[PDB]
């Protein structure tokens, strides 16, 4: 009764002398994550997530070796559990981008990150370690129709059906390492020491080999089109066929949220997600 007390044997080993009741537990979908001052401990809730935990550690070790221009959670220990280093710094509010030199600097750092992700996609240690699913967008569309259309109005279903149609048109690219959920909260910064400096990136649960348009769409979602355009132009990705891929994938974000909220039993996320479609 209380995850901390329940796992106290392991925590005394992994964090000797650390009071368990002083820690913190984020409650994930697959994992309970115990937060310590410089590291976290991933405990698999289900026996599905415990079966994949060895795979996940291999992925994190691949990420930790890559040149991304920043930090990633490094596997410190695995045994079942995975201990990861905590990336320092905090998310940057969209507010800070109003200062144009700050915007310039942050855009530049995003470019380095995406470049390194793109470059890493050509590797083999990466390609053979990381998920690389076929037609993930077709499977997604099948899931939306099955699980979400019944929650939707006729106009909603029509609008969503256009969005899923657009997905068929996407090339099934596996060029780059794709974070998969590269929102503002997942990118951490050092602030109050001159202009913001990228510390690192977290929440790699969705990481795969795929299309970087996905990471770009996420940035645009978190910070708006102006800032995304600044990144697109700095990185030389402001072409038409990229823009199309971005827009198509960006339009699945509310539906992705709903689909996961549907499976979660998280009704607030489901309502928020379905706001357009009913």
């Amino acid at each position: 009764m209380g995850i901390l007390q329940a796992n106290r044997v392991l925590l005394s080993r992994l964090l000797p002398g650390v009071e368990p009741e002083g820690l913190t537990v984020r409650h994930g979908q697959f994992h309970q994550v115990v937060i310590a001052s410089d590291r976290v401990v991933c405990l698999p809730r289900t026996a599905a997530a415990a079966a994949r935990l060895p795979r996940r550690a291999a992925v994190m070790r691949v990420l930790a070796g890559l040149d991304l221009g920043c930090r990633t959670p490094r596997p410190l220990c695995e045994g079942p559990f995975l201990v990861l280093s905590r990336v320092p710094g905090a998310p940057l509010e969209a507010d800070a981008l109003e200062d144009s030199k700050v915007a310039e600097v942050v855009a530049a750092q995003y470019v380095t990150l995406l470049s390194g992700l793109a470059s890493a996609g050509a590797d083999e240690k990466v390609r053979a370690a990381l998920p690389a699913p076929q037609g993930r967008w077709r499977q997604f569309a099948a899931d939306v129709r099955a699980e979400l259309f019944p929650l939707m109005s006729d106009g909603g279903c029509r609008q969503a059906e256009r969005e899923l149609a657009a997905l068929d048109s996407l090339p099934d690219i596996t060029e780059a390492v794709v974070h998969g959920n590269l929102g503002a909260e997942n990118v951490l910064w050092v602030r109050d020491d001159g202009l913001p400096r990228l510390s690192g990136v977290i929440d790699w649960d969705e990481v795969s080999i795929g299309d970087p348009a996905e990471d770009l769409a996420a940035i645009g979602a978190g910070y708006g089109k102006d800032f995304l355009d600044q990144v697109l132009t700095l990185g030389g990705w402001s072409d038409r066929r990229m823009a199309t891929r971005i827009a198509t994938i960006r339009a699945t974000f509310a539906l992705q949220q709903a689909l996961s909220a549907c499976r979660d039993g998280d009704e607030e996320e489901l309502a928020d997600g379905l706001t357009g479609y009913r």
Binding site: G180, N181, L182, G183, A184, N186, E206, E214, A217, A218, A221, G222, T252, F253, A254, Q256, Q257, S260, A261, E269, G273
Partner: peptide, 6 residues
């Protein structure tokens, strides 16, 4: 999760 993708 949340519009970014969670």
């Amino acid at each position: 999760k949340a519009x970014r993708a969670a």
